[PDB]
Nucleic acid binder design. Structure first.
Lengths: 46, 271
RNA sequence: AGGACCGAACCGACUAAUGUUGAAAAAUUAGCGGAUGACUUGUGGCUGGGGGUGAAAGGCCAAUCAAACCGGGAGAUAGCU
RNA sequence: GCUCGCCGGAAGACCAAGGGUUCCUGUCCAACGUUAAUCGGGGCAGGGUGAGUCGACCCCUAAGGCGAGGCCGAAAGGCGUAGUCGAUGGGAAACAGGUUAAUAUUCCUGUACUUGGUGUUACUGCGAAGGGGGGACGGAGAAGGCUAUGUUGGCCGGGCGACGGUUGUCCCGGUUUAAGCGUGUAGGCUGGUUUUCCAGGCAAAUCCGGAAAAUCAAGGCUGAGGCGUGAUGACGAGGCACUACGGUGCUGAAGCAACAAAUGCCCUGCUUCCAGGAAAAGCCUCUAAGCAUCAGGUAACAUCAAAUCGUACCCCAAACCGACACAGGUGGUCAGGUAGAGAAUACCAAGGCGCUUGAGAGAACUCGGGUGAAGGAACUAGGCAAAAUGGUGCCGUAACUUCGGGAGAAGGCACGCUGAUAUGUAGGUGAGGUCCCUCGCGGAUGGAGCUGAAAUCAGUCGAAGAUACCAGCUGGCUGCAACUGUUUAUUAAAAACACAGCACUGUGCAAACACGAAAGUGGACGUAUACGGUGUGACGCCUGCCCGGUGCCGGAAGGUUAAUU
RNA sequence: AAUUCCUUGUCGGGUAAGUUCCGACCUGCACGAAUGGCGUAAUGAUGGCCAGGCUGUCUCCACCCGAGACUCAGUGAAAUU
């Protein structure tokens, strides 16, 4: 049975990558929230 | 010529084809071709704005000359070609100076015929003149709504308009819909009629033929649920309401023309 | 020639049995339908929640859908246990 | 190590995606492994990924994204021009052999190729953000010519048999060789060359397009394979000195022909059809502004450069997605033998495996199968399940019908092996020879050799010859839907949805309509033989009466009637 | 009748016996003409009914071949309370 998660690095970066987050005002707020919480990994870049 | 397919299998029993041997059996003129990407009825927002559009065969756009402003230079018809972008056929014409162009094919135009445009052009089918110089009561096609803008009326397979009267700077025309409309007596028109009259006699014969044209299936609306369509549902087949579009308009006689900007060029709207 | 015929790959899921703290949060075995087409498949792209998409079942939208998920208003309110 | 069993259109081999050291060596057995474990994809340490030619990067663009100004919007922000990004597509070049415990078209040996920089020499009109050509494109079908590959013969090496026979029409193995360079064949396409002229290609043009003359028929382009060279080489079954019996130097015979033959190549071809089949750059040409004893351009030779990143290993799976070492899911490439129409099926090759608890016993009962006296649907909601039919050729085949069908209707007969016709026939393939020639990969004749159905007659074995696997049950009446299709992923596949056809109605183009506070976009680069909405649902015969009610479309006198005054 | 309550309507066909099925009748509880009426060849993993063949479906079960169940060694769960 085909499952929901079908990995693809290119699609992963284009959807949730660091540059994708910085491209919009709402995306930049996601980074601000995560930085405030002290997340070690800000995004899924690597 | 209309040809009826033999019933060798279901889906071919009711097929009626329109076969025209005069059409060119080769590739079109490359310099007058352009890319034409399908849209699926979706606008720049990505939303479906026109339903029942999608799929179909790949097509290339042919640059057709709807203005016919190359006055005073005779041209000769080279061949007739099949145009997937319209119901009518098109003709490739070569001018005396060596330029080639595409035009709508009139009724009785064939390879080797000579055409011309301008004020002094002869009154023959395929010739384009300002409607001021065209005798009243004649049949024309590819009519311009404004001078120099390009033909916009009577461009379909076997359509045409008739010049009824010419009082001043305007000419009264009888459109295929029966409307009596008047336009400036400086708009160009082409003598004759668009020649594909047999186009309306074809029978697709099966569902797949419609899909080849890029038409997607239509769901009635009485077969949906109330949340989807005003015609809604019910236990069985009820339909106890006045017919109405999606979004709630009567669409059984209600008029929707609310332009009022011109409302002066119309005389005998129709019927 | 054909939304033509028989039939593998491939795409489906009509019947029965098994399984039901399963090998598997829908599968296995034996049969079964389509199989040049309104076919099928890889990669990328677009449509966002009273909105999308829907050959139309209230179907589907990340094992969740007669209004997704996450955070917030929020210790909503509960003449009821 | 010897046997046995299983897969073999994979359960073999090579990749992408994804994972990220799982790869090799040494060492260890607590935990992990559904048991033990000396073993492991486990612990610990060390080692391993070598490129001008493979891929990425790079040049070019598709859908689409972003978007200087701009237009629009309470703010946030939306759309979009010039532009700039974006492969799943286009764009230069490497092959064979050898080698490591683990990498190789990357290292080594041999032999090649591509694009740039610089320099010398000779001859020279060079020049683009512009013009033209080219790149450049669909479905289906049909053959013909080929190769991969296989079979047999010949050749070379070895063998003479654990039990009757086996020096022969006997048995086993091998019989391999690339890119590149030269040749330009089967075959495909196109009439060439010269001169003059012109409202076209935003200006120009010797280029493209157009027009008018003259002169010739052979010009050019494309093109699988074959042959030659590459190769006096490499490889090579097996021997022979070393041989920690783990393995290395040297040496190494034959290395041909015929036949069969692809889903691969010629073929981006040819024929045909309607639903009419990307873009841009590299590349080839044309000139403009400019530069002309310069700079640039073509050719030869020499020289230099081709960086950077990926390269281990798994990849139908124990390493990816499923919480598991999970009977699930996962795109591309390779395609041997016998039988067979076949990539079905059975047994095998190369290769890979026996699926990580076993040992006994031979109760009920459950699961998966085999057989069955007499009866044969009496079972049951229902022939559920099971049994049965099953291939090829020939004969033969009803009602009804839209004349296509129904139809493989139904039903019947023949199928093995051996010999002969014919020491292997019809057919296919085609050597030598002869002759011709524009003397070439040519043409005609010629028939050796090779391959090889089908049929008839006669004989013969068994209970049974389409013997296994494989492989339609058939017929009669009737409801519904015309039909192929679509649907509740995970209890409903249907009479439900679509459907071609039909009708009503809206819509004159800045169309109706739809998404949007708006700009704008779809409709459509369409124009009433068009587009939207609604109902009906092939086809045939047809579709009657009612406008009081509700809606819709017109009407113009009168009554009533908002802001405002 | 995919529509009929009374109802297994009445008559005929098929069966030794037919609330289903097929053909007629018309008292249509409560059919009817594009939310279409009546026919219709072909088609259907579609609903109902009847035959031939076939059989462990059954009368009525018997035996046999395998995997569990049972015993030994190792590992070692669950709902519930």
């Amino acid at each position: 049975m085909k499952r929901t998660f079908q990995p693809s690095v290119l699609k992963r970066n284009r959807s949730h990558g660091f540059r994708a987050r910085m491209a919009t005002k709402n995306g930049r707020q996601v980074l601000a929230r995560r930085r405030a919480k002290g997340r070690a990994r800000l995004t899924v870049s690597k | 010529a209309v040809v009826k397919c033999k019933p060798t299998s279901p889906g071919r029993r009711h097929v009626v084809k329109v076969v025209n041997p005069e059409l060119h059996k080769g590739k079109p003129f490359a310099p007058l071709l352009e890319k034409n990407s399908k849209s699926g009825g979706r606008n720049n927002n990505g939303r479906i704005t026109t339903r029942h559009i999608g799929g179909g065969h790949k097509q290339a756009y042919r640059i057709v000359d709807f203005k016919r402003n190359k006055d005073g230079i005779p041209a000769v018809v080279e061949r007739l070609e099949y145009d997937p972008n319209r119901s009518a056929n098109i003709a490739l014409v070569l001018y005396k100076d060596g330029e080639r162009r595409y035009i709508l094919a009139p009724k009785g135009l064939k390879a080797g015929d000579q055409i011309q445009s301008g004020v002094d052009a002869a009154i023959k089918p395929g010739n384009t003149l300002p409607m001021r110089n065209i005798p009243v009561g004649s049949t024309v096609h590819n009519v311009e709504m404004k001078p120099g803008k390009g033909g916009q009326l009577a461009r379909s397979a076997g359509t045409y308009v008739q010049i009824v009267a010419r009082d001043g700077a305007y000419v009264t025309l009888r459109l295929r819909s029966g409307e009596m409309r008047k336009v400036e007596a400086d708009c160009r028109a082409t003598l004759g009629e668009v020649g594909n009259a047999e186009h309306m006699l074809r029978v697709l014969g099966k569902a797949g033929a419609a899909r080849w044209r890029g038409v997607r299936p239509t769901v009635r609306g009485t077969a949906m649920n109330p949340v989807d369509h005003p015609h809604g549902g019910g236990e069985g087949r009820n339909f106890g309401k006045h017919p109405v579009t999606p979004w709630g308009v009567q669409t059984k006689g209600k008029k929707t023309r609310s332009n009022k900007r011109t409302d002066k060029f119309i005389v005998r709207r129709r019927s």
